[PDB]
Design a protein around this ligand. Structure first.
Ligand SMILES: CCCCCCCCCCCCCCCCCC(=O)O[C@@H](COC(=O)CCCCCCCCCCCCCCC)COP(=O)(O)OCC[N+](C)(C)C
Ligand SMILES: CCCCCCCCCCCC(=O)SCCNC(=O)CCNC(=O)[C@H](O)C(C)(C)COP(=O)(O)O
Lengths: 84, 76, 66, 109, 51, 487, 615, 70
């Protein structure tokens, strides 16, 4: 009944992004850019955002779902949301 | 919230829990019991049973209108 | 943003007429099944004669003339 | 401006279409064991069309993709219960702030 | 409570499992016991005493 | 010995005493007005007690000469039909006085004086047994109501609404007065008991009946003339609407019961399909137009037209279920509708608005009001255990016996009546709050809680045991059912 | 002792709603639960005394409406039929009250919920124990008011308010039909009392003039009453309110819509049987409507994914079964199936609510799976309920549904064949979606989220005692009451139900038909279970057909969207009436047309006329 | 903000005023003429014929001649 701390969110989000086949889990900092630090396809960013969505059981409205292009933004969005 | 604690409602409001709900609960039973006595006494008086029961039923302890309307030809 | 004059009353994959056609087909299924039941004529295939009661089909006990 | 906006806007419409198609595909295939191949094929639909570079032919492809998705979409999608349009939405909402209640409103003199 | 990968599943208390198993066993035994008594009747193999 | 003289003189003394009191003494004016209204109400209640319910003759008759040859004179008397109307019109006045209790410092003595003159004029209307003087007090109500609408109106529209109401009432009144004059010249007198024993030639029944219908149908708005009621009703103070809907809408039906259904038994039968046609479409049209209204007081005002047109179906059925059950509906309507306008008046006094859009979520800030508002919502939608259902159902069984089709059409009235009645409650009470529009709230005070109490008690008492009211009328309504009949 | 049965829920509601601020969330629960439980035990003595002792009691308090002959007094009639409804309604109400103590443990406004439940129980008791047609109507409309109040118990939601208002509109059309029927009853017999009407229900053989038509007096009254029964029981004509009414709390679904207030129509038909028996034309309509409702609900409920909505269509199908069982003029079997269903459907709703509450209010079957090990008790309970519902042999649902089907077979008439066919196919469909609900929620590989599984807790004691009692009921009560209700020549009903000697086919239902007919429901249930298993547990998931076939997608939409009733009916009736309210009645009839010929539209020419007087 | 009076909105207030000032909004088009001549001139006639014929058929069933409802 208590919202999890930020570092607890960091653990789960970094685990989600680490558990991806195309990425290289050698260096995955919380401050990374999907299309600039990991070098991925444009589409697989959508898959990672989705997998984050069901992993925390929250529905991101489609408008700013694609705005999440960095691990930093994803953590902030899944933290400032109260119902998560 | 902060303002719903300043609103008086008969039901009690959200998450109502008075300090003495145990004592109030006991009183409410006794009040319901006291008002149920005249209803039971009234019911045992105005009730009619045209048919005698097959076996001795508990309602024969208080009710007395058993087999009374058998002469329906003189009803009003 | 002035409000609309009818601002007091406010299945997306179908239209009203297309869905009405679908409903009409669904109810025509029932109508056709009823017509088939009529065509079967189960009344003439009853395996027993109508039940006959004593004392002239219980005329007195059913409110008939004594 | 077209090289930065008229082309990049489609690069966002395609992301939106991919998201909606993936959610719909998960909705249709109830079991997780079956969703994997369906999603793989769904991305293979997009991954084969990456060879295009001229706007003269991509735009109608996006229009056709939206038309296709709009008719194979699930009639009853899945919504999180507390999300808008869900079942638990607005069940016991937090009361709005700034609302105050006054006492002794109507009192003579 | 057993954790496989982060997620944990709280083991149900003994009272719930015992009650569920008992009710299911009672249902099965009752079904078989009824099938023993009037099972032939519904199959049409034998009337109760009609014939 | 309580007679009709004292009941009528009490408002006279109340209005005279305040007439010569300095306006600086605001407290004394309110106390004396309220005391006079309460004394009149108790006088009416006592008059109920000593009311014989076995004779069709008019009771507590009083006479006062008007013309030198006693041709026309002040004949005051009550029967089983107009007794409850007198009780209601004396009971509603103290509530109206209590409505403007807080803001009375601005109205002054001319407010209570106007309401007491109103009570004086309405008591005599239900008690007059003379056709001409019934017209004199019938149209004497305009001046106090004209003053109430104009002087203490809400916006500048009060000039238009007062003009429209006054013009409609005048055009009905004089066309009725010509018929009254023709009756006086032919018969010789205007006494009701004499006019009920005089045979009218069949040709004169239609003309006189039409002329009487012209004035009465305006005050019981049928179809062509319910356009003055909404405007004049919305442009009225909170207590002003209670008088207009509580009593002023009961003149037309009472006029039909007293001077039309008996003086022309043959004409009434011929025009029965005409009344059924007008009332059936009025129930359908008005209960449907109510759905697309946005003003709080313009929705309930449209809930009265459907209810009052359901009454005229009952009266013209000419049986005990119909005529007898139509009286209970007006007593129920006089309490349910006037209580709803109190609920709207509660909302308007705090938040100076009436649009339903601004209101919502009051269930979380005004719970006592929501409980009281919901109860009168149930009564307005004809729920059993309420006084409206008894009248509504008795009218239906009284019209089905005469015409099954008109009882079917009138039965859709409760279908539509239950539609907007609950849909309004959902908008106003249930839902989420809107702090952008309005944010300060206050539930019912001591006055509002106490004011609604007699309405709550008097609505279920008539709804679960209407035998108290019914048994006082059957001797009087049965003699009304047959007048020309002798078999 | 019999007035206490009716008025204990009223007193409990009047205490918990007027003085709930002093009792809190616990005292308000205790008052209502204790009052309803005492009413339940009093109903148990009432069953031991009236139904088993064969001595009915008639109790009149005071006259309510006294016109010249429109007498509808405050009378209570306890006969064999009434007592069965008492021991069903009050027992289910007490169990739901006990269930809601733990269900509404975190909701803020628990006392008002219990007050609403108690007032609903009081209205249902007034309905069942009604001596007149008006007290019956009083309960018949109070039950609708209580359901409306309970459906939007969460007033903040918008869907709840829409569902509640739709339910009120449908019940209002039903009430209009019932009111017309009651008006017809008084016009013939000049009474509304049940005893006089049922005594004089055979003599009248005249014809009326109804709405420019010459019809039969009894047939018209029976049809009008059946209109009201359709309105309340969610039959073919008016049923869309029931699936939408699931927006309320789960205990509201379990009591308000499963056991009671949907069986109100069946109870009214069964009670008015001494009147419906003399209008053979109405029985055909009843049979057709029941068969259509059963088949339509069975077809609609096979593709729903919401856990609560699937069960609502099961309730609709069972009510259709009861309706055309009444249509074969066999009311004993109808009441037997009513009492049977009020056990294994209340159990189903309670177990589904126990699953939903523990799953963080997750209602979609696509997002639950593998809950059998986690929820042992509730899985077993839903297994028992589903097996009873499908009609597993030698179980509560087997002693009534099979009898109804074989009775429909032996009704050798045009109407009977249609009902038999639809009720036979509905068995297969019912088995299919019941087993799909069981499979998806409990036995398929897990499809839920990590958070829902982590926060799991089985039903505590207050939510388990009513479950266990309902399980024992759904196990044994059907067998126990099989002999007394649907036996041969049984006198349990006494004069409660009348079946004319001509239309009595109960004896031939047992030994006049091939044994294959008595085994059709079991074979169809097995086929449906096999189909559900082969489409859910193990399958290649050929859903690609739903993504490549245009007809398949539209066919899937047809069953999912309630046969396109809500969409079509809205656009063609509700929207049309909303336009009929403004665009004509308000826009043209009374807007300016009266004004232009009135006092100021053109009558203001006096300004252009008085000013000319200077000439 | 120490006032209970509503913060009225220009859009809502203007919309309500327009919806209440509809008296002066006729153009006397064919739609209004047809609408008032059908749903205000024909439906009352149909209903009146319905009640009159219902009375006539009630009269003929009892054998009594028709009543002159004029
Ligand atoms: C008239 C014949 C039929 C009678 C049917 C009665 C059915 C109940 C009718 C009234 C129900 C109340 C609905 C209107 C009020 C809506 C809810 C409300 O606000 O009421 C208050 C007051 O509580 C009540 O609802 C009291 C009314 C119901 C209890 C009294 C009923 C007594 C028994 C019914 C009548 C007895 C005879 C019935 C048979 C003729 C409860 O507030 P809370 O639950 O605490 O939550 C609100 C949030 N906040 C606190 C912040 C404001
Ligand atoms: C319910 C129905 C389910 C869905 C059914 C299928 C719906 C869609 C069917 C049609 C799909 C298509 O082929 S059309 C969608 C894609 N069409 C193309 O032509 C891709 C060309 N590439 C690009 O646009 C960019 O490179 C970009 C992709 C942004 C990568 O960003 P980067 O520049 O960084 O690499």
């Amino acid at each position: 009944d208590d919202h999890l701390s930020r570092e607890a969110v960091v653990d789960r989000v970094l685990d989600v992004v680490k558990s991806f086949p195309k990425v290289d889990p050698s260096k995955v900092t919380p401050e990374v850019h999907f299309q600039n630090d990991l070098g991925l396809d444009s589409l697989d960013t959508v898959e990672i955002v989705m997998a984050i969505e069901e992993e925390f059981k929250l529905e991101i409205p489609d408008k700013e779902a694609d705005k999440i292009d960095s691990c930093s933004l994803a953590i902030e969005y899944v933290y400032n949301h109260p119902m998560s | 919230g902060d303002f719903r604690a300043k609103v008086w409602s008969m039901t009690g409001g959200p998450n109502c829990r008075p300090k003495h709900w145990r004592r109030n609960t006991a009183i409410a039973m006794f009040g319901v019991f006291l008002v149920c006595i005249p209803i039971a006494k009234l019911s045992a008086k105005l009730e009619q049973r045209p048919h005698m029961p097959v076996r001795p039923i508990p309602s024969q302890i208080w009710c007395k209108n058993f087999g009374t309307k058998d002469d329906y030809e003189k009803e009003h | 943003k002035p409000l609309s004059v009818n601002d007091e009353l406010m299945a997306d994959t179908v239209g009203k007429y297309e869905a009405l056609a679908w409903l009409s087909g669904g109810l025509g299924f029932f109508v056709g099944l009823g017509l088939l039941a009529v065509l079967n004529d189960k009344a003439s295939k009853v395996p027993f004669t109508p039940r006959v009661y004593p004392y002239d089909n219980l005329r007195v006990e059913l409110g008939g003339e004594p | 401006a077209a090289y930065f906006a008229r082309r990049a806007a489609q690069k966002e419409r395609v992301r939106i279409l991919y998201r909606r198609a993936l959610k719909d595909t998960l909705n249709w295939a109830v079991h997780r064991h079956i969703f994997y191949r369906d999603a793989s094929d769904l991305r293979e639909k997009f991954n084969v069309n990456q060879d295009v570079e001229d706007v003269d032919r991509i735009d109608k492809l996006i229009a056709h993709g939206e038309a296709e998705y709009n008719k194979w979409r699930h009639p009853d999608p899945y919504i999180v219960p507390w999300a808008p349009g869900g079942s638990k939405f607005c069940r016991n909402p937090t009361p709005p702030a700034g609302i105050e209640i006054v006492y002794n409103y109507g009192l003579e003199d | 409570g057993i954790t496989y990968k982060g997620v944990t599943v709280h083991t149900p208390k003994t009272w719930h499992t015992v009650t569920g198993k008992g009710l299911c066993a009672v249902m099965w035994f009752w079904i078989l016991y009824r099938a023993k008594q009037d099972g032939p009747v519904v199959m049409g193999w034998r009337h109760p005493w009609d014939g | 010995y309580f007679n009709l003289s004292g009941l009528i003189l009490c408002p006279v003394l109340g209005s005279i005493i305040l007439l010569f009191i300095p306006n600086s003494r605001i407290r004394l004016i309110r106390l004396i007005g309220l005391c006079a209204s309460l004394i009149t109400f108790l006088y009416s209640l006592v008059l109920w007690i000593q009311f014989d319910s076995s004779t069709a003759k008019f009771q507590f008759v009083e006479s006062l000469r008007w013309l030198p040859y006693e041709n026309i004179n002040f004949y005051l008397g009550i029967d089983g039909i107009s007794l409850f109307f007198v009780i209601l019109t004396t009971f509603l006045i103290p509530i109206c006085i209590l409505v403007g209790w807080s803001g009375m410092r601005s109205y002054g003595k001319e407010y209570i004086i106007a309401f007491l003159i109103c009570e004086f004029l309405m008591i005599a209307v239900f008690c007059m047994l003379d056709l001409l003087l019934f017209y004199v007090f019938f149209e004497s109500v305009l001046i106090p109501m004209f003053i109430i609408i104009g002087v203490w109106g809400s916006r500048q529209r009060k000039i238009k609404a007062a003009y429209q109401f006054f013009l409609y009432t005048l055009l009905g009144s004089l066309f009725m007065l010509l018929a009254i004059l023709l009756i006086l010249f032919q018969t010789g007198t205007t006494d009701l008991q004499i006019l009920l024993t005089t045979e009218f030639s069949e040709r004169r029944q239609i003309f006189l009946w039409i002329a009487f219908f012209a004035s009465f149908a305006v005050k019981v708005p049928m179809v062509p003339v319910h356009i003055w009621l909404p405007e004049a009703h919305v442009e009225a103070p909170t207590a002003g609407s209670v008088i207009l809907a509580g009593i002023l809408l009961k003149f037309g039906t009472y006029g039909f019961l007293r001077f039309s259904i008996p003086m022309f038994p043959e004409a009434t039968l011929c025009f029965t399909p005409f009344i059924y046609t007008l009332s059936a479409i009025a129930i359908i049209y008005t209960s449907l137009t109510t759905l697309r209204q946005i003003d709080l007081k313009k929705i309930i005002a449209y809930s009265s037209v459907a209810h009052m047109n359901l009454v005229t179906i009952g009266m013209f059925s000419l049986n005990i279920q119909g005529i007898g059950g139509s009286i209970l509906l007006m007593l129920s309507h006089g309490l349910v509708s006037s209580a709803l306008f109190l609920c709207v008046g509660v909302l308007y006094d705090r938040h100076k608005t009436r649009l339903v859009r601004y209101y919502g979520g009051l269930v979380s800030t005004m719970p006592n009001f929501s409980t009281i508002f919901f109860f009168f919502t149930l009564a307005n939608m004809s729920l059993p255990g309420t006084s409206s259902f008894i009248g509504e159902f008795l009218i239906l069984v009284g019209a089905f016996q005469r015409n099954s089709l008109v009882a079917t059409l009138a039965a859709l009235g409760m279908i539509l009546g239950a539609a907007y009645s609950l849909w309004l409650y959902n908008r106003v009470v249930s839902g989420n709050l809107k702090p952008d529009f309005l944010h300060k709230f206050s539930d019912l005070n001591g006055r509002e809680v106490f004011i609604f109490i007699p309405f709550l008690v008097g609505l279920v008492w008539m709804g679960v045991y209407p035998k108290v009211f019914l048994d006082c009328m059957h001797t009087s309504v049965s003699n009304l059912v047959q007048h020309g009949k002798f078999h | 002792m019999y007035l206490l049965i009716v008025f204990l829920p009223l007193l409990g509601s009047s205490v918990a709603g007027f003085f709930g601020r002093f009792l809190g969330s616990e005292g308000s629960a205790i008052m209502t639960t204790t009052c309803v439980s005492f009413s339940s035990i009093l109903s148990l003595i009432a069953f031991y005394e009236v139904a088993l002792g064969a001595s009915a009691c008639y109790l009149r308090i005071a006259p309510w409406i006294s016109s010249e002959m429109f007498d509808a007094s405050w009378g209570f009639l306890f006969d064999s039929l009434t007592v069965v409804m008492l021991i069903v309604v009050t027992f289910i109400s007490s169990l739901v009250h006990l269930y809601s103590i733990s269900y509404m443990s975190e909701d803020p406004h628990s006392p008002r919920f219990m007050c609403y439940l108690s007032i609903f129980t009081f209205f249902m008791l007034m309905l069942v124990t009604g001596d007149n047609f008006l007290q019956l109507f009083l309960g018949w409309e109070g039950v609708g008011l209580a359901s409306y109040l309970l459906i939007h118990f969460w007033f903040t939601r918008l869907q709840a308010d829409k569902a509640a208002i739709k339910a009120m509109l449908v019940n209002r059309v039903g009430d209009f039909g019932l009111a017309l029927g009651i008006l017809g009853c008084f016009t013939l017999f000049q009474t509304v009392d049940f005893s006089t009407i049922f005594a004089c229900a055979s003599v009248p053989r005249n014809s009326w003039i109804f709405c420019n038509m010459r019809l039969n007096a009894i047939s018209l009254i029976c049809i009008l009453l059946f209109i009201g029964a359709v309105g309340k029981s969610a039959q073919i004509g008016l049923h869309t309110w029931l699936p939408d009414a699931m927006e309320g709390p789960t205990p509201v679904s379990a009591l308000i819509h499963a056991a009671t207030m949907v069986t109100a129509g069946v109870f009214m038909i069964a009670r008015c049987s001494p009147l419906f028996e003399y209008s053979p034309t109405a029985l055909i309509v009843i049979t057709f409507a029941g068969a259509m409702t059963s088949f339509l609900a069975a077809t609609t409920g096979i593709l729903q994914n919401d856990l609560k909505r699937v069960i609502a269509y099961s309730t609709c199908s069972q009510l259709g079964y009861m309706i055309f069982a009444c249509g074969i003029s066999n009311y004993s079997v109808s009441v037997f199936h009513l009492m049977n269903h009020a056990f294994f459907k209340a159990l189903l709703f309670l177990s589904a609510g126990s699953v939903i509450h523990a799953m963080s209010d997750e209602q979609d079957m696509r997002k639950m799976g593998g809950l059998a090990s986690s929820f042992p008790l509730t899985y077993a309970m839903m297994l028992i309920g589903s097996l009873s519902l499908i009609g597993f042999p030698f179980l509560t649902g087997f002693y009534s549904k099979d009898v109804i089907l074989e009775l429909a077979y032996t009704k050798y008439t045009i109407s009977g064949n249609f009902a038999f066919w639809l009720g036979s196919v509905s068995v297969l469909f019912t088995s299919y979606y019941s087993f799909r609900l069981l499979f998806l929620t409990f036995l398929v590989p897990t499809n839920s989220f990590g958070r829902d599984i982590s926060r799991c807790h089985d039903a505590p004691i207050p939510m388990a005692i009513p479950l266990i009692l309902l399980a024992l009921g759904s196990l044994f009560v059907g067998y126990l009451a099989k002999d007394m209700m649907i036996g041969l020549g049984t006198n349990f009903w006494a004069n409660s139900l009348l079946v004319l000697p001509k239309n009595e086919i109960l004896a031939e239902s047992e030994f006049a038909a091939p044994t294959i007919i008595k085994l059709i429901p079991i074979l169809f249930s097995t086929l449906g279970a096999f189909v559900a298993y082969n489409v859910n547990l193990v399958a290649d998931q050929f859903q690609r057909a739903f993504q490549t076939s245009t007809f398949c997608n539209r066919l899937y939409s047809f069953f999912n969207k309630r046969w396109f009733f809500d969409q079509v009916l809205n656009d063609f009736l509700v929207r049309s009436f909303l336009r009929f309210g403004y665009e004509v009645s308000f826009e043209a009839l009374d807007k300016g047309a009266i004004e232009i010929l009135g006092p100021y539209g053109i009558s203001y020419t006096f300004r252009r006329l008085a000013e000319r007087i200077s000439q | 903000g120490g006032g209970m009076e509503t913060n009225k909105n220009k859009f809502i207030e203007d919309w309500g005023s327009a919806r209440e000032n509809l008296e002066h909004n006729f153009r006397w088009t064919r739609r209004n003429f047809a609408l008032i001549g059908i749903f205000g001139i024909a439906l009352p006639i149909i209903v009146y014929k319905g009640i009159v014929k219902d009375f006539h058929m009630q009269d003929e069933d009892a054998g009594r001649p028709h009543r002159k409802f004029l």
